[PDB]
Amino acid sequence: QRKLYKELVKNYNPDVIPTQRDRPVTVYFSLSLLQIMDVDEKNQVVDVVFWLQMSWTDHYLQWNVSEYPGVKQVSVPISSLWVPDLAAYNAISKPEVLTPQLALVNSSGHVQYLPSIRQRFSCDVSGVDTESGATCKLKFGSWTHHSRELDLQMQEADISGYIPYSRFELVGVTQKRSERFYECCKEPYPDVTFTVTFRKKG
Amino acid sequence: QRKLYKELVKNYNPDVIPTQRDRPVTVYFSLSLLQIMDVDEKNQVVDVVFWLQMSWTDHYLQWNVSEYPGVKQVSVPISSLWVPDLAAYNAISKPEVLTPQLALVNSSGHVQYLPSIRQRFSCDVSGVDTESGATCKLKFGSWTHHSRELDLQMQEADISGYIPYSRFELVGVTQKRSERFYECCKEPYPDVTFTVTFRKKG
Amino acid sequence: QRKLYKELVKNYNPDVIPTQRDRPVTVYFSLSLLQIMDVDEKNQVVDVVFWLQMSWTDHYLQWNVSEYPGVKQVSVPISSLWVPDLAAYNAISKPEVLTPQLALVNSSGHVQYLPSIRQRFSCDVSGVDTESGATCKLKFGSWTHHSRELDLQMQEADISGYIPYSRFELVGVTQKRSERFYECCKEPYPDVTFTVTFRKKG
Amino acid sequence: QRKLYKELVKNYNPDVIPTQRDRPVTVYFSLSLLQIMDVDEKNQVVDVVFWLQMSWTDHYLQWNVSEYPGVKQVSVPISSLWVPDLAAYNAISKPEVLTPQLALVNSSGHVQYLPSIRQRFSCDVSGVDTESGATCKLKFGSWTHHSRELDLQMQEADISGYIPYSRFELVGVTQKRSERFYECCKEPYPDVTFTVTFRKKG
Amino acid sequence: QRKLYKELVKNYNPDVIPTQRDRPVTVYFSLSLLQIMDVDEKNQVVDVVFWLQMSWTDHYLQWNVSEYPGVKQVSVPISSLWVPDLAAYNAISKPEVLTPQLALVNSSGHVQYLPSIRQRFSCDVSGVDTESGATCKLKFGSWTHHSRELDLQMQEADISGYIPYSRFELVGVTQKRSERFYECCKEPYPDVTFTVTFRKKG
Amino acid sequence: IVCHTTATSPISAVTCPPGENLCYRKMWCDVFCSSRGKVVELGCAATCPSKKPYEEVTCCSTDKCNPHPKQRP
Amino acid sequence: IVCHTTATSPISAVTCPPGENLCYRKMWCDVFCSSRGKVVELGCAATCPSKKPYEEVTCCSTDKCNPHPKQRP
Amino acid sequence: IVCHTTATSPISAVTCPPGENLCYRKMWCDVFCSSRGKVVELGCAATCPSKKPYEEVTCCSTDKCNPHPKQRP
Amino acid sequence: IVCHTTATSPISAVTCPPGENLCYRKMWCDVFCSSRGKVVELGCAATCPSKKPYEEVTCCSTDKCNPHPKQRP
Amino acid sequence: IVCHTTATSPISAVTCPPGENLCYRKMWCDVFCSSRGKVVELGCAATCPSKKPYEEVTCCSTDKCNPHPKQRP
Ligand SMILES: *[C@@H]1O[C@H](CO)[C@@H](O[C@@H]2O[C@H](CO)[C@@H](O)[C@H](O)[C@H]2NC(C)=O)[C@H](O)[C@H]1NC(C)=O
Ligand SMILES: *[C@@H]1O[C@H](CO)[C@@H](O)[C@H](O)[C@H]1NC(C)=O
Ligand SMILES: *[C@@H]1O[C@H](CO)[C@@H](O)[C@H](O)[C@H]1NC(C)=O
Ligand SMILES: *[C@@H]1O[C@H](CO)[C@@H](O)[C@H](O)[C@H]1NC(C)=O
Ligand SMILES: *[C@@H]1O[C@H](CO)[C@@H](O)[C@H](O)[C@H]1NC(C)=O
Ligand SMILES: *[C@@H]1O[C@H](CO)[C@@H](O)[C@H](O)[C@H]1NC(C)=O
Ligand SMILES: *[C@@H]1O[C@H](CO)[C@@H](O)[C@H](O)[C@H]1NC(C)=O
C-alpha cells in the first residue's frame, strides 16, 4: 500500500527548492541546546550539542489521504527530499550529526526534520569563570538563498532539556530572527542568532 | 540456488517500515555491555562499547523453503533491508560501529542484527570513585516512529559479556522499557533505558 | 518550472574544464581569513579558518531567461558541475569544508562558489610572540592546469571578516597573484599567494 | 585478452557466500603480527598492526585457461567479489586497513586476500612491565555464519616480520582454532584465537 | 570537442592493468619529501608529508591528435583510469591524500599522477637528537603485481621541496630500486626504498 | 469517579480508585517538547497535585474530564 | 522629506520622520562582503551620521536620494 | 548408557564410556549469549558435574536424555 | 640586443633595455621540479647573473639566444 | 663452476667467480612468506654461508645445482 514512496520521488529533484513562484519557502527554525561539551579559552571556541528543529512545506510532497489506505505520515531520508541549506556562520568545524537522517511528512506536505548535532563555534569564552558569565552567538541562515527564495522564520526557543549536572549553568538564552541587505540583491538575507550566556557552576 | 537475493530485493524499499496495519512492527531490544572505555569527570561523559541485539519480522522478506533448495537463512547487508531508526538520545557522539554491517533472516521473515558499537553518552561520573559508584542511563528509542508504527519491546539484560580486567567494576545493570505520551499523537512513545552503575576497582 | 536542472546536466560532464578554443577558463580567487585557530611552534604549522571566494563562467551552463519562467539563478551542488582543481601547495592536512557544497549560477553562465574551510598549512610561527610577528604564505593554484587551460586571477583580499576576540591580531594581509614558467609547457603556471602576518595580543 | 573481468562479475553477487550444497566455504586464516604500536594500562587496550592472510575458493570465479590467452591470475578489488565477514570480537575500534583493497584469484577459483591492518583490542596490559609479560588474545571469526555455511581453518602464524627495534619484545605467539556450540543452530561456531605475550624491552 | 572523455572510458575497466604480453606496465616512481611533521621516540614512528611522482603508459588511453581539435592533454580523476597498486610496506596508518585526485594524460597514452600525501611509517627515531641523526626507510612497491605484470622503475630523487624552517634538517636522502625473489613466481618482486636521515636542528 | 490514565497503553479510562475523587493532567516540557509536544500525564489523586515551576497541572471532578489533549472530555 | 529605509522588508520608501530631513546610506564590509557585497543600510537622521574607519556614509536632501545600490534615486 | 556429546561435530550420540553412567548438559552464558544463546555442552561423567554460579548443570540416566536444546530426548 | 623575457605572458621577445647587452636563462628546481620541470627564467642584465649552488645560469649575446627550453634560439 | 644467481633479473646462470667453488641458496621468511613464499637467494661463496636461526642454507658443487625452487637443477 506504500506505493506512495515510489510516487513521491518520481518527478522530484531534491536540488530544487519547492516554490510556486512569488511565494517563498518558509522554514521554521528552533534550537534546543542540550549540553555544553567544552570551552577552549585558549583558542576561543565552544563545543556544544543541540537538537535543531526545522520544518517547512514542500508543495511537491503531498498525497490524497484516500488514494492511500490510512497513510498519515512517512519517514523519508533527508537525501530523498529537499532540505534548507542552513549553515552555522560562526562554526569552525563540520557538524557531526548524531541522530538518524530521517524526516517526517504530512499528507498535506509539511516536512518535519529535527537532527541531533554536535559542533564547535568561534566564541569568546574568556569570561566563563566570572559570575557574569561569557556569551556565545550561534548565527544560522541559508547559505545560497534569500528572503524571496527562502524565508527563515524562528518559533520556539526551548531552554528546557539542558543537562542538569553539566559543569556549566545557563544564565540566559536568547533566540532572535533578523534580516540584512547587502550591496546586491534587492531582497534581504534572513538569519536566526541563537545567543547563550553561561558560567561555571560552583 | 541463490536467486533468493535477487527476488528479496526486487520490490523492496528499505525506507519503508514493514507495517501491516493493526500490526505495528515490533522490535526486540537488548544491550550487552562489553566494556567501559573511559570516563570524563570534567565534561561528564562515558565512553562505552557494547553488543546491540535487535530483531524484528519483515513481512516482505520471506521465502518458500521448497522453491529454494536448502536455504535456511541468509546474511544480507543492513542497507539492503529496512532497519529500526533507533537513536541513543543521551549520546554525544556519532556511533562507531565495529562489526560488519550484516543481518540474518529467517525463511519466515525474522530479521536479526547484532552491531558492535562504541559511543560516548552524556552522564554524571562524579561519584565514580566512591564505593557507592556513579550511574549512567543509556536511553534508546525510535527517532521518527511511535507505538502504532513501531513498538519497541526489550529482551534479556545480559551483562556476562563484560570485561573482567576492566579498571571499572559493574555493581548493577538495569534494563527497563517505558512509554511516554506527548501533546499530540494519541499513541505513546516506547524507549529502552539501559541503566548501569560502576565504581573504580581497588 | 525547474526543468532547467534536468537540462543543465544533460550533456554535461564535470570532469571537463569548460573552455572554448582560443579562450581559457578564467577563475577569480579571493580569500577572507576568518580566524587563526592555533599555531604549533614545535612542528611549524598554523590552523586557520577562512571563506574561499571562487567564481568563473561555464559556457555549458546557461539558459534562455524566457524559455524558463522567472528563473534568475539556481543552487547546484559542486559535484554536478565543473570546479577548479585548486590546491593548497603548502597545506599539510586535507581541507575540512564546513559550509554546504553548493554554488550559484547566472542565467548567463556565471558560477560562484564560497566554501568555508578549516585547514593547516606548513609555516614558520617561531616569531609569533615577538611584536614584529610571524608570517605565513598560503599558496594556492591549479593542480593539473596552466595559463592556457585555466587562468587564475585574484580579486583582492578581505581582512574585514577576521574574528576580533581572537588571541591573535592581524598586523597585515597581502594577497598577490603570480606566474611561474617551468622546463616544459610554453605556458606558465599562475598561483595566488595569500600572505599573512600576526602577533599575539596583550 | 581481459574480457574475463566483464564475465567474472556478470552473474555474480558478492553478498552471497559461495556455498555448494553441503560444501561449506572453507577459509584459511593466518595472522602475521607486524608491530605493537602502543599499550594503555589505564583503559586496558593494545594498539597493534598486522598482515592478515585470508584465502578461500569461490566456485563462481574460475575460467578456462584456454578461452583466455595466458591469463594466470588477476587482481580484483575485494568489493567485486565475496569475502569472509570476519570480525575481531575483542576489538574496540574500527579496523584501519592500510594496504590496497585487492585480492588475487586462481584460474581455478582460489581467492587470496592479505590486508594490512591497524586496530585496538580490549586486553589486560597491566603485567607488561614484568619480566613475565602481559598477554593478549585476538579472537576472530565469522559474524553471521557457522560451520555449515563457512568453516574457518587456520594455519600457524608468522612471528617473523616483527619490528626488531620495537620497544616491546615478543616472548611467545599462539594461534589456535576452536569451535563452540550455542543454544541454537546444531552447527558449532568456529573461531581462531591469536594469542600473544610481550614484555617491555630494557 | 571533448567527446574524448566519453570515448576514453567506453570500453575501459580501471581494474585491469594495461599489459601488452611481454610488455609489462612500467611505472616510474619518485618521491619529493616535503616536510617531517613529527617523530615519536616512544612508539618509533615518523609523520611525514611528500609529493609522490608516478607515471606510466596506458595503451588503452590514447587518441588521434587530428580526430580531436587541439586536444593536447586532459585531467581525468584517478578513479576513471587504472593506477598502480603501490603500498607503503612499512606504513602504519592509512595515507591521507591532500591534493585533488587527478592525473594528466598524453594523446599518446602517457599518464602522470602526482598526489600530495601525509602518512606515518614505522621507524627507529631514537637517534634523532644525536648529530649522527636517525634514519628511516620508506619501502614502496606493488601489492598484487610482480616484474612480469608491473615493473617499478625509479628516477631522480628530490630534496628540493623540503621546508627550510623545519625543526629537523635533512643530512641525506637515498632513493634506490631493488628486486626480491620469492619461493614461487619465477619473476622477481620490485620495490623502491626511499631512505632518509635527519637530525634535530640547533 | 471515572478518569483517564496514562499508566496503561493505549490511554484507557480507569475508575479513579477509592479516596481519590479528582482526575488530573500534568504536562512537562522536555527536549522533544519543541516537536512532539509537552509531555502528557493523566491519573488519579485525592489532593490535586502541586504545580512545579515548569510543570502545568489541571484537576477536575467530572467523569473523563482529564482526556488527552487530542481527545474530547 | 521622503526616504528609503532598510528597517522594513522589502526596502520601502518611508517619509523621513520629523526633525530628520536627511536621507542616508551607510555601508559596512563583513565576511560576505567579498561575495554578497558591502552591507547596505538606509535610514533617517537630523544630523548626517559620522563615518567610521571601515564604514562609508553618504547623505542628501532630495526625496528618495538614498536608494539601494541596485535601484534608482 | 548412550549419550549425546558436543565433542564431535555435528553433535552425535556416543555411548557414554565405562564408569560413566550419567549423560549431562552444562550451559554457560558468554558475550553472544544475548543473541546466539547460552553455550551448550553435552558429555559423560560418573559423578554429575558440579554447578558453578553462572553455569547450569543437568544430569540423567535415560539414553539420549541430554540432547541439544533444539532436539528431542 | 633583442632578448626573451619571462616577465610577460606569454613569453615574448623584448629588446633587452639599454646598458644590458646580455640575454640570460636561470633555472631553479623546486617541488614540481620532479614533474613540471626546472623553473625557467629569461631576462636581461649588463653583467651575467651569478650562479647559486642549486641554480643554473647561462648567458649570451646573440639575438633571441635565451629561448624557452621548448623553443628555438 | 657455473651457478645460479639472483643478483641479475631474471635469475640467470653466472659462472661462480674465482675462489668461490660453491653454489648456494638461502631462504628467509618475511611477511609475504605466508602467501608469496620464502624469500629466495642464489649466489656464490668460497665457504658455504652460515645458517641463521630463521634462515635456511644449502650448498653444493655441481653446476647449476642451486636453481630456483620452481626450476630444475
Ligand atoms: C588519424 O586521424 C585521421 C583523420 O584526421 C585519419 O584519417 C586519415 O589518415 C591519413 C593517414 O594516412 C591522413 O593522411 C589523412 O589526412 C586523414 N584524413 C583524411 C582522409 O584526409 C587517420 O587514419 C588517423 N590515423 C593516422 C594514420 O594518423
Ligand atoms: C511452497 O513451494 C511451492 C513450490 O514447490 C510453491 O509453489 C508454493 O508457494 C508452496 N507450495 C506448497 C504447498 O508447499
Ligand atoms: C529565447 O527563448 C524564446 C522562447 O521564449 C525564443 O523565442 C527566443 O528566440 C530565444 N532567444 C534567445 C535569448 O536566444
Ligand atoms: C549575473 O549577471 C551577469 C550576466 O551577464 C554576470 O556577468 C554577473 O557575474 C552575474 N552577477 C551579477 C552581476 O549579478
Ligand atoms: C577449455 O577451452 C578449450 C578452448 O576453448 C576447449 O577446447 C575445452 O573443451 C574447454 N574445456 C572446458 C574446461 O570447458
Ligand atoms: C590454484 O591455487 C591453489 C592455492 O595455491 C592451488 O591449490 C591450486 O592447485 C591452484 N590451481 C591452479 C594452478 O589454478
Ligand atoms: C608525451 O608522451 C611522450 C612519450 O613518447 C613523452 O615525451 C611524455 O610522456 C609526453 N610529453 C609531452 C608532450 O608532454
PDB file of N, CA and C in Angstrom, chain C residues 81-124:
ATOM      1  N   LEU C  81      28.481  20.115 -11.388  1.00  0.00           N
ATOM      2  CA  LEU C  81      29.176  20.917 -12.387  1.00  0.00           C
ATOM      3  C   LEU C  81      30.681  20.947 -12.151  1.00  0.00           C
ATOM      4  N   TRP C  82      31.413  21.455 -13.137  1.00  0.00           N
ATOM      5  CA  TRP C  82      32.867  21.549 -13.056  1.00  0.00           C
ATOM      6  C   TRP C  82      33.287  22.574 -12.010  1.00  0.00           C
ATOM      7  N   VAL C  83      34.470  22.369 -11.445  1.00  0.00           N
ATOM      8  CA  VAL C  83      35.004  23.270 -10.439  1.00  0.00           C
ATOM      9  C   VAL C  83      36.526  23.229 -10.490  1.00  0.00           C
ATOM     10  N   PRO C  84      37.178  24.390 -10.330  1.00  0.00           N
ATOM     11  CA  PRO C  84      38.640  24.497 -10.357  1.00  0.00           C
ATOM     12  C   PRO C  84      39.331  23.532  -9.399  1.00  0.00           C
ATOM     13  N   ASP C  85      40.367  22.858  -9.893  1.00  0.00           N
ATOM     14  CA  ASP C  85      41.121  21.902  -9.090  1.00  0.00           C
ATOM     15  C   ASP C  85      42.173  22.597  -8.225  1.00  0.00           C
ATOM     16  N   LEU C  86      41.785  23.704  -7.598  1.00  0.00           N
ATOM     17  CA  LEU C  86      42.698  24.450  -6.741  1.00  0.00           C
ATOM     18  C   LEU C  86      43.234  23.578  -5.613  1.00  0.00           C
ATOM     19  N   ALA C  87      44.493  23.799  -5.251  1.00  0.00           N
ATOM     20  CA  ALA C  87      45.129  23.035  -4.188  1.00  0.00           C
ATOM     21  C   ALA C  87      46.053  23.912  -3.351  1.00  0.00           C
ATOM     22  N   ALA C  88      46.053  23.685  -2.042  1.00  0.00           N
ATOM     23  CA  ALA C  88      46.900  24.451  -1.136  1.00  0.00           C
ATOM     24  C   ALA C  88      48.289  23.825  -1.099  1.00  0.00           C
ATOM     25  N   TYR C  89      49.140  24.253  -2.025  1.00  0.00           N
ATOM     26  CA  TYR C  89      50.502  23.741  -2.138  1.00  0.00           C
ATOM     27  C   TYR C  89      51.190  23.506  -0.801  1.00  0.00           C
ATOM     28  N   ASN C  90      51.160  24.511   0.067  1.00  0.00           N
ATOM     29  CA  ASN C  90      51.814  24.411   1.367  1.00  0.00           C
ATOM     30  C   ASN C  90      50.952  23.842   2.489  1.00  0.00           C
ATOM     31  N   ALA C  91      49.812  23.261   2.133  1.00  0.00           N
ATOM     32  CA  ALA C  91      48.927  22.675   3.132  1.00  0.00           C
ATOM     33  C   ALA C  91      49.496  21.336   3.595  1.00  0.00           C
ATOM     34  N   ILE C  92      49.188  20.954   4.832  1.00  0.00           N
ATOM     35  CA  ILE C  92      49.678  19.692   5.379  1.00  0.00           C
ATOM     36  C   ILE C  92      48.556  18.825   5.955  1.00  0.00           C
ATOM     37  N   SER C  93      47.320  19.107   5.552  1.00  0.00           N
ATOM     38  CA  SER C  93      46.170  18.344   6.029  1.00  0.00           C
ATOM     39  C   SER C  93      44.970  18.567   5.118  1.00  0.00           C
ATOM     40  N   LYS C  94      44.254  17.488   4.829  1.00  0.00           N
ATOM     41  CA  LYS C  94      43.083  17.549   3.966  1.00  0.00           C
ATOM     42  C   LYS C  94      42.170  18.679   4.438  1.00  0.00           C
ATOM     43  N   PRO C  95      41.655  19.489   3.498  1.00  0.00           N
ATOM     44  CA  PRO C  95      40.768  20.616   3.803  1.00  0.00           C
ATOM     45  C   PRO C  95      39.386  20.196   4.292  1.00  0.00           C
ATOM     46  N   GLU C  96      39.030  20.640   5.495  1.00  0.00           N
ATOM     47  CA  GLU C  96      37.735  20.320   6.088  1.00  0.00           C
ATOM     48  C   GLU C  96      36.714  21.403   5.751  1.00  0.00           C
ATOM     49  N   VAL C  97      35.860  21.126   4.769  1.00  0.00           N
ATOM     50  CA  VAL C  97      34.839  22.081   4.357  1.00  0.00           C
ATOM     51  C   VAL C  97      33.691  22.091   5.370  1.00  0.00           C
ATOM     52  N   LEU C  98      33.371  23.275   5.887  1.00  0.00           N
ATOM     53  CA  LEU C  98      32.315  23.424   6.886  1.00  0.00           C
ATOM     54  C   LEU C  98      30.946  23.758   6.302  1.00  0.00           C
ATOM     55  N   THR C  99      30.934  24.591   5.269  1.00  0.00           N
ATOM     56  CA  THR C  99      29.694  25.013   4.630  1.00  0.00           C
ATOM     57  C   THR C  99      29.170  23.999   3.603  1.00  0.00           C
ATOM     58  N   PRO C 100      27.886  24.117   3.215  1.00  0.00           N
ATOM     59  CA  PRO C 100      27.274  23.213   2.234  1.00  0.00           C
ATOM     60  C   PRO C 100      27.968  23.267   0.876  1.00  0.00           C
ATOM     61  N   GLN C 101      27.977  22.135   0.182  1.00  0.00           N
ATOM     62  CA  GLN C 101      28.615  22.034  -1.125  1.00  0.00           C
ATOM     63  C   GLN C 101      27.725  22.564  -2.245  1.00  0.00           C
ATOM     64  N   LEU C 102      27.391  23.850  -2.185  1.00  0.00           N
ATOM     65  CA  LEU C 102      26.544  24.458  -3.208  1.00  0.00           C
ATOM     66  C   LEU C 102      27.142  25.712  -3.836  1.00  0.00           C
ATOM     67  N   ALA C 103      26.799  25.943  -5.102  1.00  0.00           N
ATOM     68  CA  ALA C 103      27.277  27.103  -5.851  1.00  0.00           C
ATOM     69  C   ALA C 103      26.134  27.719  -6.666  1.00  0.00           C
ATOM     70  N   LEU C 104      26.165  29.039  -6.838  1.00  0.00           N
ATOM     71  CA  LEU C 104      25.125  29.737  -7.590  1.00  0.00           C
ATOM     72  C   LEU C 104      25.538  29.969  -9.035  1.00  0.00           C
ATOM     73  N   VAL C 105      24.554  29.995  -9.932  1.00  0.00           N
ATOM     74  CA  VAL C 105      24.826  30.190 -11.353  1.00  0.00           C
ATOM     75  C   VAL C 105      23.930  31.218 -12.046  1.00  0.00           C
ATOM     76  N   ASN C 106      24.557  32.091 -12.831  1.00  0.00           N
ATOM     77  CA  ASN C 106      23.853  33.125 -13.585  1.00  0.00           C
ATOM     78  C   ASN C 106      23.203  32.478 -14.804  1.00  0.00           C
ATOM     79  N   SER C 107      22.082  33.033 -15.250  1.00  0.00           N
ATOM     80  CA  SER C 107      21.400  32.504 -16.425  1.00  0.00           C
ATOM     81  C   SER C 107      22.367  32.627 -17.594  1.00  0.00           C
ATOM     82  N   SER C 108      23.364  33.488 -17.415  1.00  0.00           N
ATOM     83  CA  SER C 108      24.387  33.729 -18.422  1.00  0.00           C
ATOM     84  C   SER C 108      25.431  32.617 -18.384  1.00  0.00           C
ATOM     85  N   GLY C 109      25.724  32.130 -17.181  1.00  0.00           N
ATOM     86  CA  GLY C 109      26.702  31.069 -17.033  1.00  0.00           C
ATOM     87  C   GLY C 109      27.745  31.353 -15.971  1.00  0.00           C
ATOM     88  N   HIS C 110      27.535  32.417 -15.202  1.00  0.00           N
ATOM     89  CA  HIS C 110      28.468  32.785 -14.144  1.00  0.00           C
ATOM     90  C   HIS C 110      28.271  31.913 -12.909  1.00  0.00           C
ATOM     91  N   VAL C 111      29.276  31.103 -12.593  1.00  0.00           N
ATOM     92  CA  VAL C 111      29.211  30.220 -11.434  1.00  0.00           C
ATOM     93  C   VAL C 111      29.987  30.802 -10.257  1.00  0.00           C
ATOM     94  N   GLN C 112      29.400  30.750  -9.070  1.00  0.00           N
ATOM     95  CA  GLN C 112      30.086  31.268  -7.903  1.00  0.00           C
ATOM     96  C   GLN C 112      30.058  30.229  -6.793  1.00  0.00           C
ATOM     97  N   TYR C 113      31.194  30.062  -6.121  1.00  0.00           N
ATOM     98  CA  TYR C 113      31.318  29.095  -5.038  1.00  0.00           C
ATOM     99  C   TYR C 113      32.049  29.733  -3.861  1.00  0.00           C
ATOM    100  N   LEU C 114      31.426  29.686  -2.687  1.00  0.00           N
ATOM    101  CA  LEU C 114      32.005  30.277  -1.485  1.00  0.00           C
ATOM    102  C   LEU C 114      32.022  29.278  -0.335  1.00  0.00           C
ATOM    103  N   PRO C 115      32.980  28.341  -0.346  1.00  0.00           N
ATOM    104  CA  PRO C 115      33.063  27.344   0.722  1.00  0.00           C
ATOM    105  C   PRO C 115      33.864  27.790   1.945  1.00  0.00           C
ATOM    106  N   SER C 116      33.374  27.418   3.124  1.00  0.00           N
ATOM    107  CA  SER C 116      34.046  27.725   4.381  1.00  0.00           C
ATOM    108  C   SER C 116      35.044  26.596   4.595  1.00  0.00           C
ATOM    109  N   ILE C 117      36.291  26.934   4.897  1.00  0.00           N
ATOM    110  CA  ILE C 117      37.300  25.897   5.076  1.00  0.00           C
ATOM    111  C   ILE C 117      38.206  26.061   6.287  1.00  0.00           C
ATOM    112  N   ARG C 118      38.574  24.929   6.876  1.00  0.00           N
ATOM    113  CA  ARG C 118      39.494  24.902   8.003  1.00  0.00           C
ATOM    114  C   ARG C 118      40.609  23.993   7.513  1.00  0.00           C
ATOM    115  N   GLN C 119      41.855  24.415   7.690  1.00  0.00           N
ATOM    116  CA  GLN C 119      42.978  23.624   7.205  1.00  0.00           C
ATOM    117  C   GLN C 119      44.294  24.102   7.812  1.00  0.00           C
ATOM    118  N   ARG C 120      45.261  23.196   7.924  1.00  0.00           N
ATOM    119  CA  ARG C 120      46.566  23.543   8.479  1.00  0.00           C
ATOM    120  C   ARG C 120      47.633  23.582   7.389  1.00  0.00           C
ATOM    121  N   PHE C 121      48.424  24.648   7.386  1.00  0.00           N
ATOM    122  CA  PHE C 121      49.477  24.811   6.395  1.00  0.00           C
ATOM    123  C   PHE C 121      50.840  24.864   7.069  1.00  0.00           C
ATOM    124  N   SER C 122      51.869  24.426   6.351  1.00  0.00           N
ATOM    125  CA  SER C 122      53.227  24.448   6.877  1.00  0.00           C
ATOM    126  C   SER C 122      53.686  25.899   6.906  1.00  0.00           C
ATOM    127  N   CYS C 123      54.105  26.370   8.076  1.00  0.00           N
ATOM    128  CA  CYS C 123      54.553  27.750   8.204  1.00  0.00           C
ATOM    129  C   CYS C 123      55.367  28.031   9.463  1.00  0.00           C
ATOM    130  N   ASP C 124      56.321  28.949   9.340  1.00  0.00           N
ATOM    131  CA  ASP C 124      57.175  29.328  10.458  1.00  0.00           C
ATOM    132  C   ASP C 124      56.408  30.241  11.405  1.00  0.00           C
TER     133      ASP C 124
END
